[PDB]
């Protein structure tokens, strides 16, 4: 409102909160992967979404989504998580990178293989 007021208690910015805080605010992280489960999403949709509870490197343990039809993951493994949430499964704020570390890319995927990690099959 008033200048005098702004002069006194000055206007204060409101910091932002990284939707993904699996620390360092850094590209991706390595994690041991505690369990490999499958769950059900919100009311509108109904699948058997695949997920894994991963013990990151920085100590935070967190649940991550496994994108693509099928995966090699299980018990131990060592995926590397990324970012981007999964608006359908709450709590799932991270996606494990496919075809990274102990994670196998989606078998046979031919479209947009950059994700789901796969290599050009016989050009």
């Amino acid at each position: 409102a008033t200048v005098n007021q702004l002069v006194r208690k000055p206007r204060a910015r409101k910091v932002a909160k990284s939707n993904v805080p699996a620390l360092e605010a850094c590209p991706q992280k390595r994690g041991v992967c505690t369990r490999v489960y499958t769950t059900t999403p919100k009311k509108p949709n109904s699948a058997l979404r695949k997920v894994c509870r991963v013990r990151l490197t920085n100590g935070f343990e967190v649940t991550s989504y496994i994108g693509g039809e099928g995966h090699n993951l299980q018990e131990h493994s060592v995926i590397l998580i990324r970012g981007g949430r999964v608006k359908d499964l709450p709590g799932v704020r991270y996606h494990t990178v496919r075809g990274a570390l102990d994670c196998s890319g989606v078998k046979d995927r031919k479209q947009a293989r950059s994700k789901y990690g796969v290599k050009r099959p016989k050009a």
């Binding site: 919100k42 009311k43 509108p44 608006k87 359908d88 709450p90």
Partner: peptide
């Protein structure tokens, strides 16, 4: 119209 909570 509205989802996951509304």
């Amino acid at each position: 119209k509205a989802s996951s909570x509304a």
